[PDB]
Amino acid sequence: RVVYKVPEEQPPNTLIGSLAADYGFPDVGHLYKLEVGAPYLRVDGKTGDIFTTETSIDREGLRECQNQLPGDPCILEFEVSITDLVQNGSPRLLEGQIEVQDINDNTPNFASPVITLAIPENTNIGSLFPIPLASDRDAGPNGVASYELQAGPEAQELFGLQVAEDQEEKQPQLIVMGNLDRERWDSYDLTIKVQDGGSPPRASSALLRVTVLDTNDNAPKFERPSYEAELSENSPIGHSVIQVKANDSDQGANAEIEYTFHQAPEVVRRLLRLDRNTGLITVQGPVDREDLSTLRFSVLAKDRGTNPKSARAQVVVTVKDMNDNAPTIEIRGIGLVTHQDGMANISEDVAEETAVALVQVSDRDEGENAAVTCVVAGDVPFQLRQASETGSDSKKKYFLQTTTPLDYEKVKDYTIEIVAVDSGNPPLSSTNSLKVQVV
Amino acid sequence: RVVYKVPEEQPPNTLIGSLAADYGFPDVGHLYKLEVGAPYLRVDGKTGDIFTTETSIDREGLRECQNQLPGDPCILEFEVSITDLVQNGSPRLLEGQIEVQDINDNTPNFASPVITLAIPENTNIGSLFPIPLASDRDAGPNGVASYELQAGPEAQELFGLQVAEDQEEKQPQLIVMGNLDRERWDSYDLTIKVQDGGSPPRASSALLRVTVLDTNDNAPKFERPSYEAELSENSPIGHSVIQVKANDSDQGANAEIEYTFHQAPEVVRRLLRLDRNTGLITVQGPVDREDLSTLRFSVLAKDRGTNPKSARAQVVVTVKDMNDNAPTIEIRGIGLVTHQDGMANISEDVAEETAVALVQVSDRDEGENAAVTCVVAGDVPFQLRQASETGSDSKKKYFLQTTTPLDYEKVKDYTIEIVAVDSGNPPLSSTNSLKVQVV
Ligand SMILES: *[C@@H]1O[C@H](CO)[C@@H](O[C@@H]2O[C@H](CO)[C@@H](O[C@@H]3O[C@H](CO)[C@@H](O)[C@H](O)[C@@H]3O)[C@H](O)[C@H]2NC(C)=O)[C@H](O)[C@H]1NC(C)=O
Ligand SMILES: *[C@@H]1O[C@H](CO)[C@@H](O[C@@H]2O[C@H](CO)[C@@H](O[C@@H]3O[C@H](CO)[C@@H](O)[C@H](O)[C@@H]3O)[C@H](O)[C@H]2NC(C)=O)[C@H](O)[C@H]1NC(C)=O
Ligand SMILES: *[C@@H]1O[C@H](CO)[C@@H](O)[C@H](O)[C@H]1NC(C)=O
Ligand SMILES: *[C@@H]1O[C@H](CO)[C@@H](O)[C@H](O)[C@H]1NC(C)=O
Ligand SMILES: [Ca+2]
Ligand SMILES: [Ca+2]
Ligand SMILES: [Ca+2]
Ligand SMILES: [Ca+2]
Ligand SMILES: [Ca+2]
Ligand SMILES: [Ca+2]
Ligand SMILES: [Ca+2]
Ligand SMILES: [Ca+2]
Ligand SMILES: [Ca+2]
Ligand SMILES: [Ca+2]
Ligand SMILES: [Ca+2]
Ligand SMILES: [Ca+2]
Ligand SMILES: [Ca+2]
Ligand SMILES: [Ca+2]
Ligand SMILES: [Ca+2]
Ligand SMILES: [Ca+2]
Ligand SMILES: [Ca+2]
Ligand SMILES: [Ca+2]
Ligand SMILES: [Ca+2]
Ligand SMILES: [Ca+2]
């Protein structure tokens, strides 16, 4: 009817207590038989002495106390029946109770010998991150008592050990104490150590890995800020113009880049295609220099981050000239010489070095492809003389003057064909006529 | 019945000849009427004098002599009838003939005031190239007599004027006297001048253009002889590896280049694609560094000439490592400790710092992705000690030794789980077990 406090895991045949403190007398005509708790306990039979056995009483692994709360003790009950050896025929039944005293026979440890914590790279100082707890099958001071953060020099002054001391359970926590930057270090090796509070203390150690996640904190940047390239007029579709490239220090989709035309006039969009993945600018239209000599635009690199960061680069492509236009001869009336549908009305009186018509010839190409030379065909008395001076210009003009004295009778009409050709390869030629009619 | 030689284009009423040399007498009872050649000739009627008219006799443009050969003269016949004025009733019929003497009234000229000759750029010295002839409506010395080649300084000492003097006709010819090279000059401006042989002489001048055709005499050349590039393991299909570029000084199809793998092992062909037109090498397979750390090959640029000229360029791509392989834990028997299906048979006698098994852990990645750390899980009396020294190698090995004194009774069997993790981002972990059974 009284309780007996006993340590667990005692050695066999350890005296727990004597019922001498109870009502019976020592070895006095009473048989002490045990009826309950047979596996663990054992009685002297003659005396009221209780003893242990070779089946060690284990607080941690005994049914009676498995799902228990911290405050409650581990109890196992027993029933010792005493029968008077004087043949009196009425056994007494003494109910008894054992409170198992705990002892530090279990080590605290973590579910896994390694722990992986994931911390965004620009988390503000003071941020907390929980660590998986260590469990101790023991109770009281023999349970989890204190953690400790063992880290290297670099890791020190970045991470600290703060512990929520909530009566529920020890909550360990990693406090961020410095700025992280995945583009500098993306892995840290901490070591966490746990101990229990009974002496001598038990301990465990798990490796705490801290990897840092990527934030889109870096925008893309182009190899060089601006791009130059040349491209031949009338190039074949698919011909490669230039390749633009930018790279981003981030990781994953925060560094995956896509290229797109930024503020490109329609005229350029029609003629150029920009492969968004490879950043390759190729031709997709008729590159005609005479329409546009040089095309300018800016390309945009955008990383695939949720809040994507941009980057701009200027690019200019100069179009190299091709000889795809022939010279053009125009004939018009100089001074008082009216022209109409390619005809002229002249008298045979003013006949020497007299300008009849003014011819201007011009070629839309560049340089040697517009270096035009012009002459008069056949045998007709009309010289082409240098009209005026534009320097060394590609377009020139000539006085179409007379070289002979004319007479209405012998010569009646004319048909003059002027021929022009450019110094190209292949060369291009044009011809234009003029029927000077005399009166 | 006699012939009369007369120049053409005479002035009207020019005395050609008198029939006084014939049988009749001057103005003696004979009427001289003209019956043939009315348009051009005219007779005095009283005398036997023949005269011209205002319809000028033209050798060049008269029907009687159009399709004639050089030797033949221009003839026109006439019939003068004489009737005796003494009423004798039997007219005599005098047949006569005029040979038109030629005079230099026509200028030699070319069909076109400009002539375009096409000369391959590496034609050997001495090669001949015909020039269109000049035509002269005149005949004899009044016809084409001599050409002349008027050229600039640069053109001089490259081209000469040689003339086939075949009795058929003057054949002008341009003789090549120096090496041409379209990659140096692709256009030349000669001037050809023709004259006739009657004095004063007539002349014409046509511009003779000489353009040079392209021969595939230049092979392509790469921007730089060799190419380096980096490429991340397991890159997405289509990702741009590098762009190779070569250019050729020729023109047209002799400079159009196509790029193809030259002597590339199949392993590289499976993983890389080379766009033959743009020369862009992109990814088309699983880039696995552990299979090949760096891929080397050579690319070929071939111009589209009929006899195409080649160009080779070496290229090496180093594969950047990714953490796509987890560490591997192997457990094997050290010394006299036989292992079988992950078991061991040990006695509790040798118990302190006694190697039970040998563990070797290794990661196929590189650097931090193979920087492995290894530990023992849970609470079990077995320490991992540094087995031996490979320096700072990525693969390590540990003695799996005992840390406590064992006894067959209290401890009966074990299950040890070794855990390994690499210093990657993300990190990869592996685990391997070993059931050491005691006897
Ligand atoms: C994004 O692109 C830029 C520009 O290409 C990269 O920066 C460049 O990286 C190369 C490779 O290391 C550097 O080459 C270095 O050159 C110096 C001499 O200039 C030499 O001493 C080194 O041994 C090395 O060969 C280059 O200097 C550097 N340029 C700049 C302006 O930074 C950048 O690395 C790329 N991004 C990533 C994530 O790789
Ligand atoms: C085929 O590609 C080669 C290599 O890119 C071209 O040769 C290069 O042409 C550029 C453009 O003129 C040259 O730039 C020059 O640089 C010098 C200083 O190095 C500067 O003083 C000049 O004003 C000019 O900017 C470059 O030097 C030259 N490199 C070599 C090795 O020749 C070549 O032109 C291309 N083929 C064709 C037909 O264009
Ligand atoms: C020349 O005069 C005729 C006569 O009326 C006229 O029809 C023609 O248009 C004139 N041409 C020029 C160029 O003056
Ligand atoms: C241990 O001994 C048992 C007994 O036969 C045997 O079956 C087993 O294979 C042995 N294992 C080792 C690792 O020696
Ligand atoms: Ca216990
Ligand atoms: Ca404990
Ligand atoms: Ca305990
Ligand atoms: Ca950062
Ligand atoms: Ca980042
Ligand atoms: Ca980014
Ligand atoms: Ca054009
Ligand atoms: Ca052009
Ligand atoms: Ca032109
Ligand atoms: Ca007149
Ligand atoms: Ca004539
Ligand atoms: Ca002539
Ligand atoms: Ca003549
Ligand atoms: Ca050449
Ligand atoms: Ca060539
Ligand atoms: Ca070529
Ligand atoms: Ca791989
Ligand atoms: Ca790898
Ligand atoms: Ca790895
Ligand atoms: Ca023993």
Swiss-Prot record, chains A, B:
Q: In which tissues is it expressed?
A: Highly expressed in the brain and neuro-glial cells.
Domain Cadherin stretches: 1-110, 111-222, 223-329, 338-439
- Glycosylated position list: 247, 345
What name goes with this protein?
Protocadherin-1
Q: What does this protein do?
A: May be involved in cell-cell interaction processes and in cell adhesion.
Q: Which domain of life is it from?
A: Eukaryota
Organism of derivation: Homo sapiens
Compartments, record wording: Cell junction; Cell membrane
